[PDB]
Each structure stands twice: as C-alpha cells, then as structure tokens.
C-alpha cells in the first residue's frame, strides 16, 4: 500500500523540475524584462 507513495514521490523531483527549471526560465527573461526596461 506504499507504492503510490514512492510513485508519487518519484514525481516530485520531476515535478519540481517544472518549477525549478522555470525559475531558470523566469530569470532568463526577468533579466531581459528588467534589462530593456531599465
């Protein structure tokens, strides 16, 4: 009865990837945001 735990656990880093990688994708333009603005 613990499978989906470890199964939904192995999702989190791959889940986290999404936000963690977009935080890159954030700053990428967030800079360019600030850049061409400022």
């Amino acid at each position: 009865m613990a499978t989906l735990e470890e199964l939904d656990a192995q999702t989190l880093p791959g889940d986290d990837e999404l936000d963690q990688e977009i935080l890159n994708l954030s700053t990428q333009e967030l800079q360019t945001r600030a850049k061409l603005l400022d």
Binding site: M1, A2, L4, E5, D8, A9, T11, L12, D15, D16, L18, D19, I22, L25, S26, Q28, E29, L30, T32, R33, K35, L36
Partner: protein, 358 residues
Amino acid sequence: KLLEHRRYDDQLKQRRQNIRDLEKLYDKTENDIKALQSIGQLIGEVMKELSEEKYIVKASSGPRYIVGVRNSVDRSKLKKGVRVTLDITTLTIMRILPRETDPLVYNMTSFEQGEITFDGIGGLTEQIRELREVIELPLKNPEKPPKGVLLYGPPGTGKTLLAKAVAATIGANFIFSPASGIVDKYIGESARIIREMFAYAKEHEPCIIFMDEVDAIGGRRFSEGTSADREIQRTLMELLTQMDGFDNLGQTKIIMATNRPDTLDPALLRPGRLDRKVEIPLPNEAGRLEIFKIHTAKVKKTGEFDFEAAVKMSDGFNGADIRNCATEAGFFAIRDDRDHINPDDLMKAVRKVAEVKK
C-alpha cells in the same frame, strides 16, 4: 502514512499548474521586450507619382519630398493622396497605408445616433416631425436633397438633445462640432479639420454633423476686420465652400446649431447652405403640459402631485425648465423626503421656477 500523495500532488498539482502561469508572462513581456527593437516609421500621403518609383509626397509631418518606392510596394497601388509609411533616413515608403485622421470622438466628436429618441423630448413635435422629414427621409426617398438645418431658441430644452434625438432616428453617425477648437491657435487647421469632419463622415456616411451654436466659427463677424477674424471668415467659408460648393451631404447630414439665428452670416442662412431655419418656441401650456407629464411625471410622483395646476402656473418654460420644475420640487422632495414628488414639492417650485424668469 498516506498523507504523502497530497504532499506529493499538493506540490505537483500547483507546481505543474504554476508552470505556464509564470511562463505565459515571459513570452508576452518578451514580445514587449522584443518589440522595443521594432522602430517607428514616418507617415505621409502620396501627393503624386513622379515616376514609377519617383514620388512627390508631402510628409504627413512636414513639407514635400522627392522619394522612391521601397519594397512590397505596388507602384500600381501607390497613388495620389495615398497615406504611406515613410522612412526616417532612406526617406522612402516604409509601407502603403489606409488612412483617417483627427480625434473622431474629440476634435471630431463621434457618437452614433442619439441617446433618446425624438419622442422623449416630445412637445417639440412640430419640429420633431418637421425636421425628421427634411432630414431623415430624403435619404430613403431618392425623390434637392436638403442643404442645412439650423436650430434656434434656448439650447438643451431638448434642443441640444434634439440633435441626439435627431441623431437617434436616422442611423447616421452623429458628429458633434463645438466651435473654437476648429481654430484655437492653431494658427490654421480649417478645412483639414472640417473636411476630415466632412470626409471621414463622407466615408463614414451616413453621418450626422452637428455644429454647436456656431457663432465663433459662424456668423458674419464684426467690422469684418481682422482679429484673426480672417481665420473665422475662412472657417465661416470653409463650410460655405463645402455647402455653396459642390460637396453634398451624401449620406452624412449637417445640423446647424444656434441659440439665436440672427447671429449668423446671412449668406450662411442661404439655401445651398441652409434649407431649414429650425425654430424651437417655448412649449405651449399644452406643449408644457405635454412635456410636463413627459419630462416630469416620469420622475416618480404621487397623483397627489399636482399635474395641471402646476402647468397652469407653468408658463414660458422650456423642456428643461419643465425638468427644472421637477428638479426644483425634487429639492423640496429630498427636502420633504420624497422619491415620489408630492404637490407640496411642486408648486413651490413652479412659482419658484416661474420666479427667476417667466
């Protein structure tokens, strides 16, 4: 033990959903970011085509220039008076363009039809009909079209409202004209103004042209000396030019406005310019009572509220004065705590309305 799926999916669901929420804004902003590279490009109308490339174009910002085509350019399509995008350095066509100018709702004032129909201000009914037939209909019956129509009497009696009520009935775009802006200073801008008022309407026709109370840009002037009056005369004439000139009202019609008629150029009143001199007398005791139960009674009122006796004391009032009668009693209403006006509120007002003037 099983609380982890949430703590897994809790993070997950939001996280995986928080993906493009953030992510959308980037590219959009990025476009904005990017578009900052996209640079402005000058404008002008082709005065004419010298050669296939060679063009005579007065800069929409300034004087004429000899220029060539550029690219994606149709030396066919390029033609007199055609708005084109122009270049800042190359100084040639940066694009071929549609065209229109002016603050349509501001310098031009663009409102479609009118707010309330002719009926709501009814009691001017003589005009109401009389104008409609000489304004609205001549469109729909090819069997002169009318030149011009000039209100006079006190404004807004429904008077200014007439225009909207007029404007409402036809379907044309009502285009309001206040005067002096058409030549503030602004040491020029006359026909360009008015012709945009003409031409836009001429293209956007049906349009109603309503020129407010035109004694600053209308009227015969003074010594007919130069105060810049020479500006006015022009402007005065610019209409004359569109009127005594071949320019017709195709589907666009012109309402002239004055509170006093005798204040206008005699030549302006002329047919070929004006075919109607629109009086707005005060409503009769009937017309009042007519307008009375119109403007007034539609504000919530008792039957206690005194209908005719008010009208009896109601004399030499206009359509808004009638409203004043209501509005004045309304003081007493809010003074008597009335949503429904009561006769008490009323005839205090009525005399009080009949007080300041007749």
